[PDB]
Each structure stands twice: as structure tokens, then as C-alpha cells.
Design a protein around this ligand. Structure first.
Ligand SMILES: Nc1ncnc2c1ncn2[C@@H]1O[C@H](COP(=O)(O)O)[C@@H](O)[C@H]1O
Ligand SMILES: Nc1ncnc2c1ncn2[C@@H]1O[C@H](COP(=O)(O)O)[C@@H](O)[C@H]1O
Ligand SMILES: [Cl-]
Lengths: 134, 142
């Protein structure tokens, strides 16, 4: 029937950061793109975790103030969420639907564990609204 | 406790997260306060109310960062200086508590959550993508 890969946002459309970048870079990309959380990839386009604005803010809470000057001394890999669900391009759409109940999006990878895209709540809701309306 | 054949006669208010459970800020709070609420709760954007509990807009971390990103430094002094009113988004989606639930369903395609209000724009709660996905999960399974 319908698969995750047929509805995901394809990897070339996905904003991300690379392993090794610092949090100033990651916060700048998040702020310019407007996204709340985005994938962390490596040169091989393998997925290592997710980095989000609230993770970043929590990592610079100092004894007395929010220590924005610390952002360029922290790498994204020290802060990124690594325990995340993963889908396969060929997984049934209903499996993706289940996984976005508790996740705003889930990353999709292929047989080689290369990042292929993201499966988001929006794309599920759009397809569900269509089905429910008809 | 509704059956599937009852779902579309339901209203937004019957499935919203009630205002007493919703973190919000005031138009006259400063950005440091809003940023602390956004960060402590982990929320991406939160409602902005006035002292009479009327809904005026949304404020999110991205908005605050776009306000304090300076040329050569993050201008953190501004968090104390600027109010939520100056930075918040005011052209926001709104649902009425008595709106048909299909209106809510459509509006969360584009929005992670939609604020719910009573008459006179009094804030009542929020209607989120997860509420929709969770309820649909129940009914699509059967
Ligand atoms: N093209 C994209 N690249 C990276 N992340 C995205 C993209 N589209 C959506 N997202 C993520 O999914 C969230 C929800 O987006 P939206 O579906 O527009 O409400 C964003 O805030 C990001 O965390
Ligand atoms: N109880 C709440 N108070 C204020 N905002 C909320 C609340 N619950 C959810 N949100 C908003 O909805 C987003 C997604 O919530 P969740 O569905 O809990 O991931 C959060 O990041 C907030 O923007
Ligand atoms: Cl969402």
C-alpha cells in the first residue's frame, strides 16, 4: 500500500547540520530556517542525531545567566539527541503514522543506513484530511 | 469516549488542551521571561495573553533569537529590554471553542498547534497536531 518513502520530504529538501559543527552554527541555521529541530549528518550522509533550539538553549544555562558566548565552544554532537526513531523508505505509511504521534518528524533511511528524508506530521495530516474528507 | 460515527459532530473545545494546562506569557513580559518559559517547558511557541486573558499572539524561540542576533555577538542585553508584544506574531490562526472539529483538523496541517478562544478572544486552550494524530490513530485502527 502507501509507503513512508512516497510521502516523506526528500533529503535534498531537508535542512541539516554536519557533525563537528558548533552550536553557534546550529543555532544560526535553526534561526534562519525557522525550524525547531533538524538532522545531524556526517559527510557520508549518515544520520547521527537531531539538534533543536530548545536543546541548545538548555545546554548554555549557566550558574547566573544564559551563556550565549559559550555556543562556539560546544559541538553539536555533545548536545544532539541520539535516541531517535528511524523509518525505512519501504515501511508502510501506517507505521510512520504511529511514530509521529509522539515525534514531530521521523528520519527515513535506506538499506545502507543513508539518510533519505523526513516523515513529518504535516504530510500525514494532509493525507489523512484528504481521506477523511472523501 | 466517542465512537467513530460521532467524531465529526465534535467540537474543537472537546479535544483541546485546556488553558489551565497551557504555558503562556503576557504581552508586557520581557523576552528573557518568555525564553525561560520556552526553554523550561521545551515548547516551540506559546500563547501571549493580556491581563484580561485575551489572546494577542504567539511567541517562539526563533522570534526571540531573530531579535537578538547581532552582527558580531548575540545581543543578550536586549532580552531584558524588549517586551513580548514587540516581537510576537499577531496574525495567528484561531479556533473558537465551539468550532467543528474538522476545522481544527484542517488548520493543524499547517500549524503545530492552534490557539482556541471563547467569545471576545478570551483564551481557552490549544488544539495540537498530536491531539489529532492520537484520536485518528484510535479510529483508523477500527
Ligand atoms: N525541509 C525541512 N528541513 C528540516 N526540517 C524540517 C523540514 N520541514 C520540516 N522540518 C522539521 O519539522 C518541523 C515541523 O515543520 P512543519 O511541518 O512546517 O510544521 C520543523 O520545525 C522542523 O523541525
Ligand atoms: N501545555 C502546553 N502549554 C503551552 N504550549 C504547548 C503545550 N502543549 C503543547 N504546546 C505547544 O505545542 C508544541 C508541541 O507540543 P507536543 O505535542 O507536546 O510536542 C509545543 O512545543 C508547544 O509549542
Ligand atoms: Cl508538530
Amino acid at each position: 500500500e502507501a509507503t513512508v518513502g512516497q510521502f516523506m520530504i526528500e533529503a535534498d529538501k531537508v535542512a541539516h547540520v554536519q557533525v563537528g559543527n558548533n552550536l553557534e552554527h546550529a543555532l544560526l541555521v535553526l534561526t534562519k530556517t525557522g525550524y525547531t529541530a533538524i538532522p545531524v549528518l556526517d559527510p557520508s550522509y549518515r544520520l547521527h542525531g537531531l539538534i533543536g533550539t530548545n536543546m541548545i538553549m538548555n545546554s548554555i544555562f549557566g550558574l547566573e545567566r544564559i551563556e550565549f558566548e559559550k555556543l562556539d565552544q560546544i559541538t553539536v554532537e555533545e548536545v544532539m539527541l541520539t535516541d531517535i526513531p528511524r523509518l525505512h523508505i519501504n515501511d508502510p505509511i501506517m507505521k510512520g503514522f504511529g511514530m509521529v504521534i509522539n515525534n514531530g518528524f521521523v528520519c527515513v533511511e535506506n538499506d545502507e543506513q543513508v539518510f533519505e528524508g523526513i516523515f513529518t506530521r504535516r504530510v500525514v495530516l494532509k493525507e489523512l484530511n484528504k481521506h477523511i474528507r472523501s
